[PDB]
């Protein structure tokens, strides 16, 4: 799973798109999404 402040992933990311419980996957850029 994607750790806090890590890239959950935007378009193109096929792995841990799920963020750690409590953190929100925020798609900042279409390809860069971070777990805040």
Curated annotation (Swiss-Prot):
N-glycosylated. The catalytic core domain comprises three N-linked glycans which each consist of a single N-acetylglucosamine residue. It is found in: Secreted. Residues 1-36 form the CBM1 domain. Disulfide bonds join 8-25, 19-35. Glycans are attached at residues 1, 3, 14. The enzyme consists of two functional domains, a catalytic core joined to a carbohydrate-binding domain (CBM) by a serine-, threonine-, and proline-rich, highly glycosylated linker sequence. Exocellobiohydrolases (CBH) that catalyzes the hydrolysis of 1,4-beta-D-glucosidic bonds in cellulose to release the disaccharide cellobiose. The degradation of cellulose involves an interplay between different cellulolytic enzymes. Hydrolysis starts with endoglucanases (EGs), which cut internal beta-1,4-glucosidic bonds in cellulose to reduce the polymerization degree of the substrate and create new chain ends for exocellobiohydrolases (CBHs). The CBHs release the disaccharide cellobiose from the non-reducing end of the cellulose polymer chain. Belongs to the glycosyl hydrolase 7 (cellulase C) family. T.reesei produces two different exocellobiohydrolases. They are unique in that they can hydrolyze crystalline cellulose in the absence of endoglucanases. This is Exoglucanase 1. The chain holds residues 478 to 513 of 513 of the full protein.
């Amino acid at each position: 799973t994607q750790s806090h402040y890590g890239q959950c992933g935007g378009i193109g990311y096929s792995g841990p798109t799920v963020c750690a419980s409590g953190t929100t996957c925020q798609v900042l850029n279409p390809y860069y999404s971070q777990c805040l």
